[PDB]
Amino acid sequence: HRQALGERLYPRVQAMQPAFASKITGMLLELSPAQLLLLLASEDSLRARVDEAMELIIAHG
């Protein structure tokens, strides 16, 4: 189930942050089942969370 979600998530993440698509998709795929379903159901929520992930990648760096 988590795998099937990630296969759908990846192209959508890639359209938002193509240079970090696999990294960010992998970060999202650690999240809870409920949060993953929310992200796949709502591109608006997904965009916010992908932006958050990108900001964390830069900050950690």
GROMACS .gro file of C-alpha atoms in nm:
model
   61
    1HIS     CA    1   0.000   0.000   0.000
    2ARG     CA    2   0.275   0.248   0.095
    3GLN     CA    3   0.456   0.149  -0.226
    4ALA     CA    4   0.147   0.216  -0.440
    5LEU     CA    5   0.111   0.556  -0.278
    6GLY     CA    6   0.476   0.641  -0.349
    7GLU     CA    7   0.439   0.549  -0.715
    8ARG     CA    8   0.155   0.802  -0.745
    9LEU     CA    9   0.332   1.061  -0.529
   10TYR     CA   10   0.663   1.066  -0.717
   11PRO     CA   11   0.550   1.222  -1.049
   12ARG     CA   12   0.350   1.487  -0.861
   13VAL     CA   13   0.650   1.574  -0.642
   14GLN     CA   14   0.871   1.573  -0.950
   15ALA     CA   15   0.654   1.838  -1.117
   16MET     CA   16   0.705   2.061  -0.810
   17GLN     CA   17   1.072   2.000  -0.722
   18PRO     CA   18   1.228   1.799  -1.002
   19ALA     CA   19   1.588   1.829  -0.876
   20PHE     CA   20   1.494   1.673  -0.539
   21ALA     CA   21   1.201   1.452  -0.640
   22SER     CA   22   1.328   1.119  -0.511
   23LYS     CA   23   1.471   1.270  -0.194
   24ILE     CA   24   1.147   1.447  -0.108
   25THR     CA   25   0.925   1.156  -0.207
   26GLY     CA   26   1.131   0.936   0.024
   27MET     CA   27   1.093   1.183   0.311
   28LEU     CA   28   0.713   1.189   0.259
   29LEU     CA   29   0.698   0.811   0.245
   30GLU     CA   30   0.823   0.793   0.608
   31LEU     CA   31   0.506   0.974   0.722
   32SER     CA   32   0.201   0.816   0.878
   33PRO     CA   33  -0.054   0.631   0.669
   34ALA     CA   34  -0.316   0.897   0.744
   35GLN     CA   35  -0.083   1.181   0.635
   36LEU     CA   36   0.017   1.001   0.314
   37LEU     CA   37  -0.346   0.956   0.217
   38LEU     CA   38  -0.413   1.323   0.286
   39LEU     CA   39  -0.119   1.424   0.066
   40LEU     CA   40  -0.226   1.205  -0.224
   41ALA     CA   41  -0.585   1.330  -0.194
   42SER     CA   42  -0.495   1.701  -0.187
   43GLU     CA   43  -0.243   1.852  -0.426
   44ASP     CA   44  -0.270   2.174  -0.223
   45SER     CA   45  -0.160   1.990   0.092
   46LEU     CA   46   0.108   1.808  -0.107
   47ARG     CA   47   0.250   2.136  -0.244
   48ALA     CA   48   0.278   2.280   0.107
   49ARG     CA   49   0.448   1.966   0.238
   50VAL     CA   50   0.691   1.944  -0.055
   51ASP     CA   51   0.784   2.308   0.004
   52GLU     CA   52   0.838   2.226   0.373
   53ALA     CA   53   1.062   1.934   0.278
   54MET     CA   54   1.264   2.153   0.042
   55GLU     CA   55   1.307   2.416   0.316
   56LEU     CA   56   1.427   2.145   0.557
   57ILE     CA   57   1.677   2.011   0.302
   58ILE     CA   58   1.823   2.360   0.259
   59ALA     CA   59   1.824   2.442   0.631
   60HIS     CA   60   1.985   2.112   0.733
   61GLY     CA   61   2.253   2.185   0.474
   0.00000   0.00000   0.00000
